Amino acid sequence: AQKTWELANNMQEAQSIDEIYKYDKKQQQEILAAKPWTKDHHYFKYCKISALALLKMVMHARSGGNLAVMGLMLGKVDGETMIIMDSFALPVEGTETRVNAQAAAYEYMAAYIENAKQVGRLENAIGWYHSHPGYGCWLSGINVSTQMLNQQFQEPFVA
Amino acid sequence: KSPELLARYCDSLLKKSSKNPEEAELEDTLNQVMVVFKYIEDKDVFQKFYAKMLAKRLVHQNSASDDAEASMISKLKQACGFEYTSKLQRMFQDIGVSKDLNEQFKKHLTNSEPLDLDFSIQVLSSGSWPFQQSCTFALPSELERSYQRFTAFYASRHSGRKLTWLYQLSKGELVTNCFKNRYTLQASTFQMAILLQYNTEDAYTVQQLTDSTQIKMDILAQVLQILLKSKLLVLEDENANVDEVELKPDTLIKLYLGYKNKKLRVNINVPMKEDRKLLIQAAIVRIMKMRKVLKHQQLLGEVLTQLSSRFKPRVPVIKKCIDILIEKEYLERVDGEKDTYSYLA
Known part of the structure; x- marks a missing residue:
């Protein structure tokens, strides 16, 4: 392979595949200060979910069986794309068609994010996810209401 | 209790007394009853005590102006609907059918060996009347032959039907041949x-x-x-x-051999005498969330599948639950289809 494939992999340096894993704080501050999603409304069109985040979300959704489960997803934004780099479960109790997250989820959110910031997790919460066990993937009325509430104040947010 | 009182008023009105109101004023007071009837918010309960009151009125042949009975139910049918007066329509039709049945049975008797007593029977119908066979009884030796005869008449005319005689609600007349005079009592x-x-x-x-x-x-x-x-x-x-x-x-x-009652028509046959709703609502809302758009019949079937296996709820209760959930703006009707619901949370 010699010179041809020596620099083609270069495990010492992150490849073009691992570029998305690097967090640029200055770029994030600039894009959140500019707020380009306020002028338009069909701004974000792509959602890039990491493999680990998808695996964790799928396993959490299946672990509930026929009962709904919910959690948060950390990530960032880039151009028109919302990137989800991780996900984390919430200690909630729900039924087959209703999950509320009354009083243990709201402390767990902040405490888990504080703990994650200690071990080098620079991403912030980008979205919330919940499972619909057996009736498709859609947004219900209360789901739309809480999505509006989250989006109106915490501007970058995808359900 | 007020509905019950209004219905007992209805009972007097139609039943029978010493004075028979004229057909002109009989419908006049019935119209006034329907004036207040629509003001009654709850209609289901009225049919509950009207069914047993009407059944006792007709099975004993104590009803007065049976023509007014037909018009009375006719007024009710256009008021609330077919489903609200479906059971009562069966009661009236059974009386009319059996009255025709008696006439043909008498003709059949003449062409064969005649009976020894005047026999009349109301056939009624199973599943629509509150009555049920509750008291065991041994058929007297004198009332058996005629019994069998009628069964034959009901086997050649109608095939595949089985009669369940109700001796509790059956009356009769008995003559005497041993008293001081010739008596005829009713018992x-x-x-x-x-x-x-x-x-x-x-x-x-x-x-x-x-x-x-x-x-x-x-x-x-x-x-x-x-x-x-x-x-x-x-x-x-x-x-x-x-x-x-x-x-x-x-x-x-x-x-008592020495019975000497002056009246010859002695009548000794004188008459005597929440939690589930929440479960249905929860089942309905869950089914509506699972299936975004549904029909009324499919929703009823799904509710029966998921929930009726526990306590077998009544369909009108489920319909009332659907209505109250509609009032709570939990699911909305869809234009273009009379029976179609969409889960609008």
Whole structure:
């Protein structure tokens, strides 16, 4: 392979595949200060979910069986794309068609994010996810209401 | 209780009294009843006590102006709907059908060996009437042949139908040939059997009557009490007050030979006498969230599948639950289809 494939992999340096894993704080501050999603409304069109985040979300959704489960997803934004780099479960109790997250989820959110910031997790919460066990993937009325509430104040947010 | 009172008013109105209101004013007061009827918010409960009141009115042939009965239900049918008056329509049609049935049976009797008694029967129908066979009874030897005859008439005409006779609600008339004069009393089948038991002997004990008629204890005791009230059966101790006499299966009751009642039409047959809703609502809202757009019949079927396996709820309760959930703006109707619901949370 010699010179041809020596620099083609270069495990010492992150490849073009691992570029998305690097967090640029200055770029994030600039894009959140500019707020380009306020002028338009069909701004974000792509959602890039990491493999680990998808695996964790799928396993959490299946672990509930026929009962709904919910959690948060950390990530960032880039151009028109919302990137989800991780996900984390919430200690909630729900039924087959209703999950509320009354009083243990709201402390767990902040405490888990504080703990994650200690071990080098620079991403912030980008979205919330919940499972619909057996009736498709859609947004219900209360789901739309809480999505509006989250989006109106915490501007970058995808359900 | 007010609905019940209005319905008892209806009962008087249609039933029967010494004075029969004219057909012109009979509908006039019925119209006033329907004026207040629509003001009643709850309509389901009214049919509940109207069914048993009407059934007792018709099965005993105590109804007055049966033509007014047809118009009365006709007014009700256009008020609330077919489903609200479907059961009562069956009751009226059964009376009309059986009245025709009696006429053909009489003609069939003449062409064959005639009976010895005037026999009339109301066939009614199973599943629509509150009545049910509740008291065991042994058919008297005198009322058996005619019995069999009618069964034959009901086997050649209608095939695949089985009759379940109700001796509790059956009356009759009994003549006498041993009193001072010729009497003709009216009594139920139970009293007729008890009084016909004395045809061959003079005195019987209570147990000897219980084992001969196979009537249960409470009804037999009540029938003996009312018969003693009519002073037709005389105990050994005349001076004892009948009401306070304690009956045991050892008293030798004998037929009163010296009965001398002045009236020849003695009538001794005088008559006597929340949590689930929340479960249905939860099932309906869950089914609506699972299936975003549904039909009324499919929603009813799904509710019966998921929830009826527990306590078998009544369909009108589920319909009322659907209505109240609509009022709570939990699911909305869809234009273009009369029976279609969409889960609007």
